[PDB]
Design a protein around this ligand. Structure first.
Ligand SMILES: *[C@@H](C)/C=N/c1c(NC[C@H](O)[C@H](O)[C@H](O)CO)[nH]c(=O)[nH]c1=O
Lengths: 262, 98
């Protein structure tokens, strides 16, 4: 069972809308677990299984930390805007986190982005920054000069982050380690004149890892399969589509192979 | 400068069957920057009672939101969603397929 812990930061230059200049959100596998904004200036627990169970000192302290980070992130953004010489609204994004696999392999990541494009990518194995432009190189030398920070980041991504992830995983086992079976239903729809399209849908399942395929006479799968997306249903489960132009629907979820005939 | 056009997806939570408890969802994803305008519509008139999940982030520096509202399906009525982004010159309206 693969799991992922990630933290996102967003800084907007001149919001020109009453929306937060800085927003910070934490995720444990596409689940909101923590949130912060420059307007509220207080860290709030999104998930219920960590709202009362986790100690209050955590939010108390990390709020002050976030307040500190906000200003730094602003300075970094404005400095880059001074390097490119732009006026207006520009976005500065940061991602940091780890990944725990089935076997137990650890994989960490740290990235910085400007205007929705990769700006600086951190590699912990060689302790180096990957720059895309000369401006990125300019911030690259200044960041690489300070080796203490690099080493800290490495040990954080490799040990500390995994620890946090394990802790969070144990707090909400009934939610994150829960298994809900999908309701599979087959629907016939005529879009073009004469062309009859067969749809297969799955509603209400967790985790989102699901496999779908259309079979002819239950022996051969077809290459004309149009796949959709694993969409959130709203209640906390997911939903997915599989369509083909015209015999059997095959959905595999949590080791269960489901077959439907038309 | 690099920006992305939003992908609008309108669908129901539970399987479509008229005269029952259901939820209409509009998934707006893969867009950049963050500033958007989203409104759900019922035969043209906007729905006020609509809740939305706060801004969410993705690995490819794109964002995604979910706008949902409770509804009862009926064959007479048709539902849609109006989305306006900076990339969009005219507010894109996507209808529910049923
Ligand atoms: C509270 C748990 C919010 N944390 C948070 C973090 N946390 C990771 C880490 O402590 C931090 O990045 C340090 O600077 C070390 O890398 N990161 C983030 O970007 N936003 C948050 O709200």
């Amino acid at each position: 069972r693969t799991h992922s812990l990630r933290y996102f930061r967003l800084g907007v230059s001149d919001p020109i809308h009453g929306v937060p200049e800085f927003i910070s959100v934490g995720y444990v596998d596409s689940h909101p677990i923590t949130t912060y904004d420059s307007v509220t200036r207080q860290k709030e627990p999104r998930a219920p299984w960590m709202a009362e169970n986790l100690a209050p000192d955590h939010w108390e302290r990390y709020t002050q930390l976030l307040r500190g980070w906000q200003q730094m992130f602003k300075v970094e953004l404005k400095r880059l805007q001074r390097h490119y010489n732009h006026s207006g609204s520009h976005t500065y994004q940061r991602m940091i986190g780890c990944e725990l696999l089935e076997d137990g392999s650890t994989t960490g990541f740290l990235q910085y982005a400007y205007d929705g494009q990769d700006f600086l990518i951190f590699n912990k194995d060689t302790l180096s920054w990957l720059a895309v432009d000369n401006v990125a190189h300019t911030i690259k030398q200044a960041w690489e000069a300070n080796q203490h920070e690099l080493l800290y980041q490495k040990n954080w991504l490799e040990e500390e982050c995994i620890a946090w992830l394990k802790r969070f995983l144990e707090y909400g086992k009934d939610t994150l380690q829960r298994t809900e079976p999908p309701l599979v239903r087959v629907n016939r729809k005529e879009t073009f004149p004469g062309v009859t399209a067969l749809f297969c849908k799955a509603h209400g399942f967790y985790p989102p890892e699901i496999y779908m395929t259309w079979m002819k006479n239950g022996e051969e799968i077809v290459q004309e399969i149009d796949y959709g997306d694993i969409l959130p249903s709203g209640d906390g489960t997911y939903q997915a589509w599989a369509s083909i132009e015209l015999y059997s629907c095959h959905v595999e979820h949590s080791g269960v192979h489901m077959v439907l005939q038309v | 400068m690099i920006q992305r056009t939003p992908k609008i997806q309108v669908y129901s939570r539970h399987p479509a069957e008229n005269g029952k408890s259901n939820f209409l969802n509009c998934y707006v994803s893969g867009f950049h920057p963050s500033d958007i305008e989203v409104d759900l519509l019922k035969n043209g008139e906007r729905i006020e009672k609509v809740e939305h999940s706060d801004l969410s982030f993705s690995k490819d520096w794109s964002f995604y939101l979910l706008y949902y509202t409770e509804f009862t399906p009926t064959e007479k009525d048709e539902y849609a969603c109006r989305v306006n982004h900076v990339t969009l010159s005219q507010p894109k309206i996507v209808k529910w397929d049923r």
